[PDB]
RNA sequence: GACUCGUACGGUCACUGAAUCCUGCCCAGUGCAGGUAUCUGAACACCUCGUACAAGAGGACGAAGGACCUGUCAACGGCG
RNA sequence: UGGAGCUUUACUGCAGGCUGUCGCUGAGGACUCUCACUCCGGGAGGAGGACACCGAUAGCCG
């Protein structure tokens, strides 16, 4: 039979219709009068959550963080550039608001590690997304069969590098086949064509 | 210069000479989905958009005939090689 | 070219701010619990740098002394008073509602508690005209018929200092010692007197703006300069 | 964030350059500003055609702007 | 078929301003309302209000 997780799935496929949509509502007026990255005790997605690895265990943190929608914040160029350089408008930047999010939950938790993120709304200025994060010094957490090996050296800030699930979609590492000639096995190593 | 609408000719198609028709050839619409209308769009974007940045040049004081030929028994038609011509008024 | 003096000015460097270290007190209206009874006495009257107007200082009876916009015929030892309750007298403080129509008011607030915003330079007073439940209107020193919410609070008189204008500078020196006193980079260099990389009008062999002064609203600072959005100019018409 | 512990007797932007006698005519062009029946005027949404869909073609509506009208020279300038 | 500074109704673009549109954004060609959001107030509450601000895009000026 259906599991209880399924039904905070099911709403959050639509977050402006039904209850949640309510919900939201309510929410986003104290998200708004909140920090950049706040701490909280439960996800908002529980279905998402353990799907990305979360567990109501010691050394797991979870984290709602906000940042601003748009384009990049760019200043105008001042020196000499060709006509295709003297753009600032349209100019976006190549890492997604999400991965922007876990990389500012992770400054806050210096000796945490991100172990994934999902979103959970956006008003028009905002964007919310929250960050599972790691406490690779905790036992509970070295002795765990599903986490332990997010305690190994290799994954040292494992965010910064781009290791994150966002940070390899965003690289364009999610295809194995066709269009991944200049992503695979690193962007810098193609000559950061991709 | 004075042209007739219709005379006897050459129609390359029937292969004999018949009575054509000669019709100014009016310009056909574009559909805009030709290779070259989507590269403006693919290569537009910041700043100078190199030859998409141009624009349509000037004119020759006269241009050449641009007709075409219509064979009046088979019904299809040919184009001919056009003569510079300042003015083209068919007769009937 | 490089960014004109009116650009200069945005970075808010010393040069442009004014001396506030050098400042007494903004004179926002004090503020009651309510039902008024709040009255002090007038302990002395000073000079406003900021303002070249005089300022009365005021020790109210729970104990708070403070510097108020003083209107003319604020003297020492006199009773002034704040709130609702308040006798409508000269120097008074009161909303905009317990006013008596036709009566001069000065240091007029914007919005209910904001201290006063209208109305506080020398001489200077706004008529209050019309009353109501919803607005009252007031003639702001400009001319202005402003719509004020009528819990705006506002003191009865003119400003002090009236008739600082009728009297010349005359000289540069006595300009300089104000202008000292102030947010403001003096002397002026005309800008038709400066060379083109520094302003619109500069350059030239002669000197002459080498355009039309009157400049679009939607003018991009560094090129709105001289006659900004004018509706018209010269005496003449 | 400066202006600003500032509020039109303010302070911003410009021209002229003590006092004295004065400062004529011109709004056509350019500039600024206001107005505007009608004309024109982009995208989204909407409608038609096209496409089992899409590209695309056309339509209706029509913001500021422009056409048009008016104001203005101690605006730019002009007074043969 | 050198460089730089400066000019402009040179060519091409980029900021900036104005203006429409989509999101934020809600209830009953024009209107009322409150609940987001905005501002004032120490606070209670007051003013405004689905506009504005902000994000995106389009036309004009530049
Ligand atoms: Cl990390
Ligand atoms: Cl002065
Ligand atoms: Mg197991
Ligand atoms: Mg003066
Ligand atoms: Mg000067
Ligand atoms: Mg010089
Ligand atoms: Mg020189
Ligand atoms: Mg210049
Ligand atoms: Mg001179
Ligand atoms: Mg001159
Ligand atoms: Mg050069
Ligand atoms: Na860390
Ligand atoms: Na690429
Ligand atoms: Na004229
Ligand atoms: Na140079
Ligand atoms: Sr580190
Ligand atoms: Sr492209
Ligand atoms: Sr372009
Ligand atoms: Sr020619
Ligand atoms: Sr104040
Ligand atoms: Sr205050
Ligand atoms: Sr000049
Ligand atoms: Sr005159
Ligand atoms: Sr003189
Ligand atoms: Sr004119």
Known sequence: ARSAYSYIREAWKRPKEGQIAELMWHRMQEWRNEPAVVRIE??????????????????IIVVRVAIRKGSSRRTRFNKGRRSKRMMVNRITRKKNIQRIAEERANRKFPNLRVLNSYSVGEDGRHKWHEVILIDPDHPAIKSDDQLSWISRTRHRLRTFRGLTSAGRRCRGLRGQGKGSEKVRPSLRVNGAKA | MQMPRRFNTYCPHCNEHQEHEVEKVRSGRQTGMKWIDRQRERNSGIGNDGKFSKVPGGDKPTKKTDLKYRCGECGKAHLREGWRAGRLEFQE | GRRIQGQRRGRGTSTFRAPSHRYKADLEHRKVEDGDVIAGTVVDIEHD?????????????????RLILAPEGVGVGDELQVGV???IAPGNTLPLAEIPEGVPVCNVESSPGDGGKFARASGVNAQLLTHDRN??????????????????????????????????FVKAGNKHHKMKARGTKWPNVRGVAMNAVDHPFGGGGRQHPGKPKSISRNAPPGRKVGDIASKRTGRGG
């Open chain 3, 135 to 168: 607005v009252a209107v007031v003639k702001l020193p400009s001319g202005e018929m402003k719509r004020l919410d009528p819990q705006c609070r506002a003191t009865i008189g003119v400003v002090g200092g009236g008739g600082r204008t009728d009297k010349p």
């Open chain 3, 49 to 65: 740098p900021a303002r070249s107007a005089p300022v009365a200082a005021v020790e109210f009876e729970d104990g708070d002394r």
């Open chain 1, 42 to 59: 439960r996800p908002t997605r529980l279905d998402r959550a353990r799907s990305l690895g979360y567990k109501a265990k010691q050394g």
């Open chain 3, 85 to 87: 309750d308040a006798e």
